[PDB]
């Protein structure tokens with residue numbers, strides 16, 4: 001409780017809890033009595049997970065309403081077309097590379113990391129037609145509460161475009177009312193951010209508890225796959241950086257070395273801060289240094305940062321393959337491309353704050369193939385959750401660099 005605790009700024013603090021916990025969990029004989037560590041520690045971690053889920057739902061709604069309504073109807077045009085194409089193609093290629101890398105490493109298992117035995121293939125997922133139908137909400141509040149992310153996305157975009165056509169109308173009462181509504185929702189969003197900042201400080205203890213249980217449960221071989229898949233992701237990320245950007249910058253006429261030189265400044269703050277939003281003003285400064293047009297970067301940067309996320313999509317595909325191979329599941333081609341589409345939609349919906357990235361994974365699993373209710377699935381989810389902390393660090397810099405690439409390419413064409 002003592003203030004100095006909250007005064008230590010180092011995000012390295014989290015890693016402290018990562019290390020100190022694992023050691024204790026690693027010591028099976030004198031400390032790692034599975035039953036006692038289980039009963040005592042597990043709830044401290046479930047508390048962190050439970051708290052983490054709370055942040056997700058309203059942030060999506062408020063951020064999308066404000067951003068879409070303020071940004072898109074105003075500038076809507078061919079610039080929007082090129083940007084949308086770029087973002088969607090990048091998401092697709094990112095998930096493609098994640099799949100290819102899971103094929104290359106095969107990180108998931110040497111022997112089934114979950115106990116298997118009841119790995120029997122899951123209940124068949126619905127065909128694509130009903131998935132696409134679901135994207136539109138059968139009822140807004142009913143689907144909002146129950147626990148569905150995407151239809152809230154739809155409804156929010158709708159409401160925002162509506163308001164934006166609205167405020168321009170003549171009658172003053174209408175303009176005033178719309179303004180008040182918008183401001184209220186924006187205030188809600190700011191509040192949720194302020195809460196995120198706080199939760200981050202409790203996070204370390206939860207990391208400590210979760211990883212301690214993970215280590216003490218299975219012991220030595222949980223770290224064999226864990227690092228393997230870890231590297232599988234990191235390489236998969238670097239490739240995305242090298243091939244995608246160097247090609248594009250090369251094609252349109254920027255020498256990539258100087259580009260990354262310039263970006264390193266923002267990438268440092270993205271990696272260590274573990275958050276995408278605060279970098280956005282740093283991104284605007286970097287663009288002003290990069291030689292990019294004001295209206296274009298002012299339109300694109302917020303919209304890209306909220307909408308477009310590629311590194312997280314690769315992380316989700318690779319984590320999905322991890323789960324599948326740990327459970328004792330093997331994925332057919334149709335299921336693979338279905339994962340492609342579903343992960344595209346999930347990366348689109350993703351929130352944009354540190355931990356949220358894991359949560360949307362639960363969506364893809366539920367949308368296709370493996371349901372979450374099977375205990376082995378949650379068991380492996382627990383293993384993922386720990387390393388997610390470090391993986392997010394590189395995912396942040398990847399996403400920011402991709403958005404910068406998009407804006408600089410568009411501006412260079414014009």
Ligand SMILES: N[C@@H](CC(=O)O)C(=O)O
Nearest residue numbers: 352353354356357395396
């Ligand atoms: N906000 C994270 C992703 C996430 O947590 O969903 C990032 O930018 O890397």
